[PDB]
């Protein structure tokens, strides 16, 4: 729970986001990047701050939009975190889930075992803390917005988790 | 509790240990390999094959001696594992520690965040988990037994460390 990469360590712009999440959160949206794929910590973290310069320069956001980004790496990148509301699932979504995104397009291609077990151990984590419910609920982003994300191989994964709900 | 690349992950030698430990483990004792380091999940996985076979094809050890080692690439792979005694620390410290060991020379060099973040939440596991006593004590190897082991500069920081007793 504790084996995030942090903010100043890949170089993020600080944040300006005010509005909270409300603890505990019901659900997690999992969605992809859709960007670059990266499988090395120096890749993960520039590609990290390529997310958030798109989210901050060029939609005007207050931060990165996802509260938490998975590398192929299996390190764990900190977003916006348990306690900011995302943009990554619209404005129904946004207020009450954690959204967290696998870095790349995994339309025609899975993320390696160790992403999945970063993503996994992310959520053992957020119940540990009190920021996610024991009882929590996955959703694709499709299944809460029209979309691919987080594209079809991962899509079929997440379906198979414990806490999946359609 | 936590994330971790087992054995098959990294094509590891099958184990032939036998020797169990009595849980809940009083001690973990910090090692280094004084051997090359690896920054990627590719590179660390390849370091891993490389400490188990000089262990088991060299010094005819049952496999890896380390209970855990740890990559610059910031994620654990197994070893022995928690229930398994280990071979880092000699027939004194062997049956009552756990051994976890960063991959690399850390005499002139420090392990970067994200390697000594896996560390200490790999510990954090091992308590959740009932491995590890939740008063465990983190020795240096140095402090039980005659080597530069873990390095002047990573021996440094296990100083620092919560669970440190010298
Ligand atoms: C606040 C919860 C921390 C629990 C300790 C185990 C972990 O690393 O998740
Ligand atoms: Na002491």
């Given at each position: 729970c504790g084996s995030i990469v942090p903010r100043r360590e890949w170089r993020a712009l600080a944040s300006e986001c005010r509005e909270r999440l409300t603890r505990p959160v019901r659900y997690v949206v999992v969605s992809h990047t859709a960007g670059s794929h990266c499988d090395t910590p120096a890749s993960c973290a520039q590609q990290a701050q390529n997310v958030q310069s798109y989210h901050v320069?060029?939609?005007?956001?207050?931060?990165?939009?996802?509260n938490f980004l998975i590398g192929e790496d299996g390190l764990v990148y900190e977003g916006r975190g348990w306690n900011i509301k995302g943009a990554h699932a619209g404005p129904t979504w946004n207020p009450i889930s954690i959204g967290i995104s696998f870095m790349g397009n995994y339309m025609n291609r899975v993320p390696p075992p160790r992403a999945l077990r970063a993503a996994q151990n992310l959520l053992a984590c957020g119940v540990a803390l009190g920021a996610?419910?024991?009882?929590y609920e996955v959703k694709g982003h499709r299944d809460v917005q029209?979309?691919?994300?987080?594209?079809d191989r991962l899509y079929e994964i997440i379906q198979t988790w414990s806490h999946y709900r359609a």
């Open positions: 320069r060029n939609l005007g956001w207050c931060d990165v939009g996802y996610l419910r024991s009882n029209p979309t691919l994300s987080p594209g």
